[PDB]
Amino acid sequence: MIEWIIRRSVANRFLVLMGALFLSIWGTWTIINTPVDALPDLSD
Amino acid sequence: LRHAIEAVPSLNNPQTFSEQKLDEALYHGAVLRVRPKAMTVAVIIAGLLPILWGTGAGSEVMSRIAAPMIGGMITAPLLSLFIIPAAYKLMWLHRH
Amino acid sequence: IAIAVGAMVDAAIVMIENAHKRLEEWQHQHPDATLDNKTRWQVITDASVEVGPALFISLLIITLSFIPIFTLEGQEGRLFGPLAFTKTYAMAGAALLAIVVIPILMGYWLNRFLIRVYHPLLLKVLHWPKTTLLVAALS
CA angle B11, B17, B20 (to 5 degrees): 90
Contact B83 C18 (CB under 8 A): no
Interface contact C79-A2, CB threshold 8 A: no
Contact C23, C107 (CB under 8 A): no
**CA-nearest residue of chain C to A9?**
C100
Report resolution (Å) to 1 decimal.
Answer: 4.2
**What H or E segment, with its residue span, contains residue A20?**
helix A14-32
Buried b (16+ CB within 10 A) or exposed e, A4-41: ebbeebbeeeeebeeeeeeeeeeeeeeeeeeeeeeeee
User: What H or E segment, with its residue span, contains residue C100?
Assistant: none
Chain C residues whose beta carbon lies within 8 Å of the beta carbon of residue B31: 115, 119
In this complex, do A6 and C79 lie within 8 Å of one another by their Cβ atoms? no
Contact C100, A11 (CB under 8 A): no
In A, which residues are within 8 Å of C75 by CB distance?
A: 42, 44
Q: Which residues of C touch B92 (CB under 8 A)?
A: none
Contacting residues of C for B66, CB less than 8 Å apart: 2-3
Closest-CA residue of chain C to B37: C14
Q: How far is C11 from chain A (nearest CA, A)?
A: 14
Buried b (16+ CB within 10 A) or exposed e, C49-72: eebbbebbebbbebbeeeeeeeee
Closest C-alpha among C111, C52, C106, C62 to residue C84: C62
Distance CA(C28)–CA(B56), nearest Å, equals: 53
The alpha-carbon radius of gyration of chain A (Å, integer) is 18
Method of determination used here = X-ray
Contact C18 B36 (CB under 8 A): yes
- The conformational region for residue A13 under phi > 0 = left, psi -120 to 50 = alpha, else beta, is left
Outline where B1-96 has alpha helix (H).
19-22, 24-46, 59-63, 67-83, 85-94
Residue pair B54/C13 in contact (Cβ under 8 Å)? The answer is no
Q: Is C122 in Cβ contact with B40 (below 8 Å)?
A: no
